[PDB]
């Protein structure tokens, strides 16, 4: 996350870290939607252009975390993947259309003060909140800057980062890039005139874009960190998978498996 701030403890209890077993590294963010289902971006698991095609045993998910690098004893829980399900029409060849995947856990993770699921939007909540100007929240352990940096030149965070960003009008999203945008995507971020900044960055993808419903005070995951060009560049916006638009697939997978 670029230009965000440290998350408060228990602020994003549905946050999940997708961790490569060997070599141990942060691959992506993800979100907890029930005790046995984790939601993420399909490109976190499958992206042929980069020779990426993970299998269940290549990965581990860490839930309940705050610190990026530390093993958080008595707090975080490790869960293993029983099965990965990628949207059948995920378009990795062109524009990451339908960038969504589900991971079923081998055993249910135990909820606690630091582990709790986020809700998925119903049609009405999505129609009401997914509007230009309305802000959502992005969280992750990704890089703090576009310019390749680590723990020596303000590169990676010590703890979970958070940033609130406004959804952008679709024509403005379209006009900011040469990539073909689809209805299964929305973009968010501040414009150059607005002053405030912020964006997701390397390592944040797969993570959640959430909104707190003013109708029932519950947090809903409206998007999945999908793609961008650079990080926090003026005139560019982060792109997110439209979760409600792909919910039929989500429901089909969960009901079936």
């Amino acid at each position: 996350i670029v230009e965000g701030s440290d998350a408060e403890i228990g602020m994003s209890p549905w946050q999940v870290m997708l961790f490569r077993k060997s070599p141990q590294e942060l691959l992506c963010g993800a979100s907890l939607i029930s005790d046995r289902w984790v939601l993420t971006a399909a490109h976190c698991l499958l992206y042929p252009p980069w020779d990426k095609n993970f299998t269940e045993n290549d990965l581990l998910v860490r839930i309940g975390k705050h610190s990026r690098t530390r093993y958080e004893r008595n707090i975080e829980k490790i869960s293993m993947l029983e099965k990965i399900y990628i949207h059948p029409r995920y378009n990795w060849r062109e524009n990451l259309d339908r960038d969504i995947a589900l991971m079923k856990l081998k055993k249910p993770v135990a909820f606690s003060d630091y582990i709790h699921p986020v809700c998925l939007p119903d049609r009405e909540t999505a129609a009401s909140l997914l509007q230009a100007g309305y802000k959502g929240r992005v969280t992750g352990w990704g890089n703090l800057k576009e310019t390749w940096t680590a723990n020596v030149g303000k590169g990676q965070p010590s703890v979970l980062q958070v940033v609130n960003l406004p959804i952008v009008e679709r024509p403005v999203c379209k006009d900011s890039t040469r990539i073909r945008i689809t209805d299964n995507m929305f973009c968010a971020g501040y414009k150059p005139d607005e002053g405030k900044r912020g964006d997701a960055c390397e390592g944040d993808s797969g993570g959640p874009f959430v909104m707190k419903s003013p109708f029932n005070n519950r947090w809903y995951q409206m998007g999945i960190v999908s793609w961008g060009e650079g990080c926090d560049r003026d005139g560019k916006y982060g792109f997110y998978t439209h979760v409600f638009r792909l919910k039929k697939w989500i429901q089909k997978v969960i009901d079936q498996f």
Partner: peptide, 27 residues
């Protein structure tokens, strides 16, 4: 059924430091 209600925030009626920014943007 208990989704989206955080143990350390909504569950105990505590607000985090920037959630108001989201509410203010809705409308």
């Amino acid at each position: 059924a208990d989704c989206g209600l955080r143990p350390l925030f909504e569950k105990k009626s505590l607000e985090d430091k920037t959630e108001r920014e989201l509410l203010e943007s809705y409308i």
